[PDB]
Ligand binder design. Structure first.
Ligand SMILES: COc1cc2ncnc(Nc3cccc(O)c3)c2cc1OC
Ligand SMILES: COc1cc2ncnc(Nc3cccc(O)c3)c2cc1OC
Lengths: 289, 289
């Protein structure tokens, strides 16, 4: 089938191959049902003398076709992208052993866990900080969209925070190239969370840069609420009727009107009525001036 | 889309509806990336006076289309099956609140966790016990197959152990009816673990009762090793080449020849060269005589 072709084809880019003997794996940083990200250290990694701390993504022993395909897909995409706010691939291990992805280590972990820790007990997160984060992410999406690449899974859990509070879009296992037709379409049910998908993605299984914009709107919401849960208290299965009747999330207690207006814009029913990521950056910049 | 139709159609069988006010939810018994099973207690459940202890399956807040569809699918199947070795549905809550599935509580939990606990520190599991378990499960599959229902996810983690060590096949979210064409076919990548799928399911995405037989073979293996990991040390992505070149798992240190021969039979390349569940029961019965 399609996956076995990809697996066999993978066997036959030496630039990205790292020797397993140079890699030492540490504690788990995060897990899922079929795969996990682990802390690791790499000896003589790409012209860097000595050991370099890194993150490593792998499957679990009981991984499925879907999870395997996602890993192969994430590697394939990451080889093509270089941007300050997109996570950086170093290489992979696939010869004699489990497939491992090696990326630059992100100091503070996911943006969601970072924001939620921030609301407890060196410096407190200001509004200007939150706007800075959104803008950094907006810039990265402006880069991806300009390559006609759709992420399909924008969410605070899928953004990483590195040294000096720099945003890193991660988790590219579901992203697709849409150069030809400008849309990606999945016939079966996605493995993307209901509460983050756009109305046309949820109902029609249609994914575009403009649907990425919708997800960025929910991401704006997570940020402003310091890691809140979208549509709080509402069951995911109710989103169909709720969105189809024109309902949207309400303004968070700690959210400016200017920011909420942007959220609502990202959530327009007509996908072309939504702003593009270039507009979002421009909007966010005006907010800090 | 297909899911939204199912969601709307669900709104409009009163026999299975339980009042949420009669249900108290307890601790988590098991979790996944998009859903969990919880311990619960039900007041006046189906003609049973007072409180009844039960298990409840629900989604998590960030559930996806796939996970929602699986829950709706599991409920729909469970309404149709009644068997001593198939888990028993009591009802569901879907009005004003999150969808919840209510089933009979299983004392010792999953068969995998039960077998693994058994290999530590009232009575020890004998060989006769393990053969008894396989036979109980074989009987349940003989019931499902006779209804032309394919489980698609036979595994020790998906079997439950109730009072008096009685086996209960669970997790029917992926099972499909195959009355018409005798085969179910998935165009996209399954969410079933690689190491449990049959050679034609893994490569060709083809699922039948005979592929259920293949999975029962791996299940036989888990049991005999008291919850061992299939193809130990071998990366899932290597299963394609390994199975296509005719390799199979070797005989476990604590496994009789008679039992291993059955495993090998379940693992024949030609699906019709495999035994049917009626033969497996007969084989297992001869083993205890
Ligand atoms: C400090 O915590 C973390 C640090 C991380 N640093 C880098 N990558 C990660 N994840 C990653 C790596 C490769 C691919 C991919 O999609 C995601 C990390 C995850 C962490 O925690 C979960
Ligand atoms: C004592 O532990 C457990 C007891 C359980 N008892 C019943 N059902 C369960 N699971 C269930 C319920 C409904 C549908 C379905 O597919 C699975 C259980 C799970 C447990 O642990 C995970």
């Amino acid at each position: 089938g399609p996956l076995s072709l990809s697996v066999d084809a993978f066997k036959i880019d030496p630039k990205w191959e790292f020797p397993r003997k140079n890699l030492v794996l540490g504690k788990t940083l995060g897990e899922g049902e079929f795969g996990k990200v682990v802390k690791a250290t790499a000896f003589h990694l790409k012209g860097r003398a000595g050991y370099t701390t890194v993150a490593v993504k792998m499957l679990k022993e009981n991984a499925s076709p879907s999870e395997l395909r996602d890993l192969l897909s994430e590697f394939n995409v990451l080889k093509q992208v270089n941007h300050p706010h997109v996570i950086k691939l170093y290489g992979a291990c696939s010869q004699d052993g489990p497939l491992l992805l090696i990326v630059e280590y992100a100091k503070y972990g996911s943006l969601r866990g970072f924001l939620r820790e921030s609301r407890k007990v060196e410096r407190a997160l200001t509004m200007g900080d939150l706007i800075s984060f959104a803008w950094q992410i907006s810039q990265g999406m402006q880069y991806l969209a300009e390559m006609k690449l759709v992420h399909r899974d924008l969410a605070a859990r899928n953004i990483l925070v590195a040294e000096g509070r720099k945003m890193k879009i991660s988790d590219f296992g579901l992203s697709r190239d849409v150069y030809e037709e400008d849309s990606y379409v999945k016939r079966s049910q996605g493995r993307i969370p209901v509460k983050w998908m756009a109305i046309e993605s949820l109902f029609d299984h249609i994914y575009t840069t403009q649907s990425d914009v919708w997800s960025f709107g929910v991401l704006l919401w997570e940020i402003v609420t310091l890691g809140g849960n979208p549509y709080p208290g509402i069951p995911p299965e109710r989103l169909f009727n709720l969105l189809k009747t024109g309902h949207r999330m309400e303004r968070p207690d700690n959210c400016s009107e200017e920011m909420y207006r942007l959220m609502l814009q990202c959530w327009k029913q007509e996908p072309d009525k939504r702003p593009v990521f270039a507009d979002i950056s421009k909007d966010l910049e005006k907010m800090m001036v």
